[PDB]
Amino acid sequence: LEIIKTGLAAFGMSGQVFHAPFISTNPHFELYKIVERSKELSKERYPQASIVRSFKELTEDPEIDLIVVNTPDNTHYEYAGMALEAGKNVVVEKPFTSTTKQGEELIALAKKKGLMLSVYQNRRWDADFLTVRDILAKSLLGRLVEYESTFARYRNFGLTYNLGSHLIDQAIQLFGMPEAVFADLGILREGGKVDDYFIIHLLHPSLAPNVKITLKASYLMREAEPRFALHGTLGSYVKYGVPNWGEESEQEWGLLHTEINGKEICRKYPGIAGNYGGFYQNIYEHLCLGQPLETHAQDILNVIRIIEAAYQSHRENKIVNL
Template sequence: MDRIRTGLAAYGMSGRVFHAPFISVSPHFELTAITERSKELSRGKYPDACIVRSFDALIGLEGLDLVVINTPDGTHYEYARRALEAGKHVIVEKPFTTTVAEAEELVALAASRGLTLSVYQNRRWDGDFLTVSQILSEGLLGHLVEFESTFPRYRNFVRPDTWKETGKDGGGLTYNLGAHVIDQAVQLFGMPEAVFADIATLRKDGKVDDYFIIHLLRPSKAPEVRITLKSSYLMCANEPRFVLHGREGSYVKYGLDPQEAALTEGLLPGTPHWGEEDKSFWGLLHTERDGKVVREPYPSLPGDYAAFYDNIYQHIRCGKPLQSDAREVVGVIRLIEAAWESSRMQRVVRI
């Protein structure tokens, strides 16, 4: 079947690292156009891609099937709306939008036009998250009672040269990494009944939030599980990425999925051992089997961000179910809004 002709709305870090490599190596996609307002940084790597100078020029290209909205957070709604109105399928980088109202409007617009609208929740395909999902599905910890997900970062200074730090066009940790850890928790346990959160700016001269701790209360699939989600830019000593406690055992995992680091170094998806984690980073499983105590590393599954784009192709060309459907990601934005309200009001907020 015809390859999906794809355009990138920007060629910053997201475009270079998380989108262009997967589009370019897939036999199902063609990297047709890249938006660069003044530079031509993409020319060396993707000489066959057309460089356009504006978003209007991108969505005006005849024959373009799919547009990736990987621009600053505050532009997601407007650019996604305009791309849908131009008749293009759309992938939006996380966070989907900054408000639930914007998200619902885009979902309705895509449905009315019969177009695909997906959100790039790529960390559903992190190896550590896939491993956690496997451990839970196999019941290795018994009845789960506690789930902690922490995304550690360390940058104890504020960068004035990026919109992510100035707050002028979105940014902030809760909409950034919060969109990932919340989405992962919802994938495992469903939407919660309520949220309790503390969101703060802890770095000197900071203009956006750089710390959050969010509790999701009584999730629909497992109301008794206590869920804690956390991230901060002041974690010089890493905390575990995942901590799971059940009535028959625990699982503790340090370290981050290796795909982002590999992509940043210029490695391409599909290279040998892609997404595989060094054994030294495998999480520790502490449980009982056949009456004997087991305390040993549990093999991490390989991560696979390419699965996101494979699913996009299967959905658009073959009608298969869309795995990161914007309709369900509206719930993530709803939870982020609730977390901010909870932090401001210092109380539990019902969903």
């Protein structure tokens, strides 16, 4: 009900694309202060923001309700820590912290002080994932029985950490944490030193324990597997991959093949647009209206636990129970 005065820690790509346009347009937030080291780039589009020269200046201002930590990766633990100690709610960009221990510390500190600690991941707000969420919300496939998600690439010259994070994040958000993890990893390309292939099964996710989950990525898929393939009792949705913050061109549309009002339909499906402002609207609804936050920092720790369970599964040739 009171406007969330927001300090933005950096005005590089991420500040200009992921953060400032939505803090600005959202009427429940004020783009109040922006850190720029020497430049005044933000003046042109955001003339009512005040430019400060240092991060500490955001933490020392009692008017600030929220600090967005989108500075370089190495600064994240220190900066989020400074902001929380100063009594500010915090958004940190992925990667949240350099260690799990650090992440646990910050969550505990936020809990102690009654503050929000959110982790920003732009892919949560992309057209493709939101379209999948919407298909599920509307039960277009009937009762869902299978979910598959693959990052297909073709490149010669670790994947489970780099692309697995996004896939695991999205699966946990839709279906909850699994009882167990199977993973098989590969180094498929000659001369490779880190995994360039994985397949992961999340066994019995808490919200939908009967749904079969497959997460995959590979650098040797010259013909791509689907970015999403979903199967239900009434139908299927299959989507192939190419920020993704608007609508999608026809070439990118998924195929929806299902039963609607008792009639079989099989058509390319435009889906719904990306909604990068959704991140901030959810923060508003959480802080002001007490609604569930979709981006709690504990999510990231949960993804890391799954990533580690996947590497353990492969290394030990075992199903890892959680």
